[model samples]
Target chain A: MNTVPFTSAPIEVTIGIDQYSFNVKENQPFHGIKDIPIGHVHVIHFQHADNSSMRYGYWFDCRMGNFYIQYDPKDGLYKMMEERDGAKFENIVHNFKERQMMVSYPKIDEDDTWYNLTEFVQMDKIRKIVRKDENQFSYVDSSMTTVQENELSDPAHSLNYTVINFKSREAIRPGHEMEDFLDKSYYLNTVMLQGIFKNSSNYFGELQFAFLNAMFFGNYGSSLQWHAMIELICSSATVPKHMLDKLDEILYYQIKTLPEQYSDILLNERVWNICLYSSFQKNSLHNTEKIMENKYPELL
Target chain B: GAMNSSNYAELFNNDIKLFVDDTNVYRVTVHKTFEGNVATKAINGCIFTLNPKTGHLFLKIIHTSVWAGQKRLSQLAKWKTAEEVSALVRSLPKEEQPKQIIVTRKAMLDPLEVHMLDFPNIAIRPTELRLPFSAAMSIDKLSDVVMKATEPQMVLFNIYDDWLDRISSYTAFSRLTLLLRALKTNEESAKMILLSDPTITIKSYHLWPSFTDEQWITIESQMRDLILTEYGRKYNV
Candidate 1:
């Protein structure tokens, strides 16, 4: 495990699309055309289970009705949706529409592009229907940071966190019961609704771009990239047989577009490497191994 | 509304307990003659109604001890063979005495097929024997011979070992061998007997003791473990 001393810092950034290239900078880029607007985003620093830090930026484009995201390095968080409102509220996080309406820059998988300037405009929050108890909520936050500082300080936290902020101007909160499961963007994306949605399933696909930028390129928290792979299998199983054949086509499209969009990460092996960095911490893997060895060799 | 959907769902979570009474006995009876001959008489038994059912043989044995005071007779010194025992019973003075001379034998050949005449027969001529032969010799030797010869196929041959030991040391060697034979044979029969229940009628001048509920419980416990462990632990443990 790579142990590096690092702490996450939250900052603001701006993103803009010029033709094909997605440009991110600290200041808003000048848009000559009135139709184009600089998307506001948030840059949150995240450390991985291996103590490596990355910044993730997320924003929403009103005109395009798409949420833009960017990330670098392998942090320990998976971003679900971005909203200006109380999207961070627990209940409103399940707004699948908001989750679905997200897009991001192509990934750069090689070297230290993560050290480059990162934008944070896409880090909007969605309102939640149920509000976690203030005490419990604060406790979770404090405990999470403590966990990040203690257990995750040396190692990037492989644990995933999802935040949903709603458009709550008055700060209205939802009840705890309304919030089910992990109530985190990463958990919702991976364990609940499968993976992030995109226009296409391949390279530069919306979700692929989002996760690539937010997790791979921009070097932010953990992303649902691994979860997406597993979801692909589940999705194939769930679909009707008639629709099953389309999965190969979908996968092909994803494969075709993935390299181009995820150019930020140079080698494909890095994705797996980053995933393995957190694999050891998973209880399921250890439990499965023990059971297979002891009682159920047939399963093995 | 209070007792509508919730009530229906409540039925799904109902708790139920199941109990099993596993006490049953099965028996097979074999008739023997003094001339070393055997014949299977009858096979009948009942199964106890319990959730976890036991074999039928256990219940049959219990019922026999309860309803029937069937006597168990051992061979005496003079009565070395079933023929001699049978002859002595015929010679008894009273007619009722001869009729009461019930000869018991262990089924040697097969579980369902018993050789009734193979075991040394005991004559239960209740009248006291008087002659050159000692009275105790006539009585104990009769039991000693049958008990000794049938030892291999009987369950409780040791019950008469004390009587065998009390007889004259001159006949001690033969008597000891007879007692050992009866016990050894019975032990072997116990293992071969199938787990079934059958009705058995045995007659003897000396009434056998009855079994108490506690004894029945103990018998079931010991027999159950023996059977299950033997069968279930084939290779695993």
Candidate 2:
């Protein structure tokens, strides 16, 4: 099937962004997918296959449109491509496997930057699925526990394939599999999150130029006006400290003036909840702090 | 060690004849040097045979713009002093200029010798030459012929020689394929251009190449006949 315009059931939630309870309907559940109905967002759902313990979250703006899709292990299309007569799938598998080897690395490096970046996106998905159904929330479900015990007690399946044996044993039930997969999935999510941070920061750096240009023209019509003006003044001014002070002044004025405009949107519960709590926690501030802790042990 | 200025001056004034398809069309009171002459020894012979060989009337492989510049340079070199060749180049309009150029001592035999070696009867037959032809003559033999036949000190044309050096064996085959295709389209040229002249030139010259000359000839002729039927529906003649 053609993958363009992914079709899935929509979910509506009264979530606010900026200052409005955006009558949010999950257009297509994923994050960072461009050209979505509202913006680019896609959500990925994780489920315990056997017991149906489901978790979901999103990785938004995962990469620009130009970004390459990493080799997918479960993709049948990729498998078919690799299996072609003069195939080079082994090379691709090897390369991605080598990359996957580092799945545990970000966890070790205190700079969970890579780990967190990948994990966060997956975490977003996992958390959402768990949020949807609390029954699916636990690390180890009963079915998984039973499977793990049986595999551990049995010898037939333990011949040579240790990893597969372990996985099979662990995955007998949804909870056990979830727990096992979560370690890796979460690690990947964190790594992806780190990637997003770097990506977003670079994007903002480029937007700084646009902001500077806008402020130069005194086009402070949007709420982003203060940010633009501050950025421009900081860039234009000779002294960094003085520029920062000027930026702070703009921010101060913006804080004073922009509230009235957002009053109605701010009043909506979900919108207010997110504006007051979620966006910064979910996107910027939380990401920033987690990434910092990941990168620098001293910072933690 | 060097020849005198007057010597070159005399050399530049020598009579030169141009032929196309073995028919002499122009006799030069003053011979003109073409850039193609310096680029390939093959091209030098091609130029001498131009008028008689129906080169201008034919497809005109080189661009018209290049022909114009070469013609002007050849005329200027003829009128000017031996040292004035450099001045001729410097005075040319710089608006659009080639990267590099040179003027060599003009000698018909220098090119002709190479030509004759490549196509032995090029001069003798001055008309109706066969395609896929080469002269048996060696480079030294060709050089000797040039010194003997053409007036000394006359400058021949020169251009940046790129194609001869970079062309691979595969490229030769590729060009042959294109040439064969062109012959199919241009019926008149096709009729004139032969599939075989010398065995090697007509056939694949490479060692252990897959396709034989017979195969290529068969393919080329079939393609040509197909084209004739397709496009020349009215021109049965």
Per-residue alpha-carbon lDDT of model 2 for A195-283, expressed as tens digits?
A: 33243222232233222212222222211322322222222212234323333333232233233433332122332233223432222
- Among all windows of ten consecutive residues in candidate 1 chain B, which has the lowest summed lDDT? B51-60
> Native-vs-model 2 lDDT?
0.27
Minimum summed lDDT over a 10-residue window in model 2 chain A is located at A157-166
In the order shown, the candidates' DockQ scores are 0.01, 0.00
Evaluated on chain B only, candidate 2 has a TM-score of: 0.22
lDDT of 2 at A248: 38
Residue-level lDDT of model 1, residues A208-297, one tens digit each, is 333433332332332333234423333221333322233333322333333444333422343333222333222222332343234323
Model 2, range B1-237, lDDT digits (tens) per residue?
123333333212222223222111111233335743333111222111111111111111211232233444443222222122223223435432222111123322222222123222223212222322111111122233333442222223211112224443334434343443444355355434443333423212221113344654564665556556546655755
DockQ of 2: 0.00
The estimated TM-scores of all candidates read 0.23, 0.14
Error of 1 at B207 (Å): 29
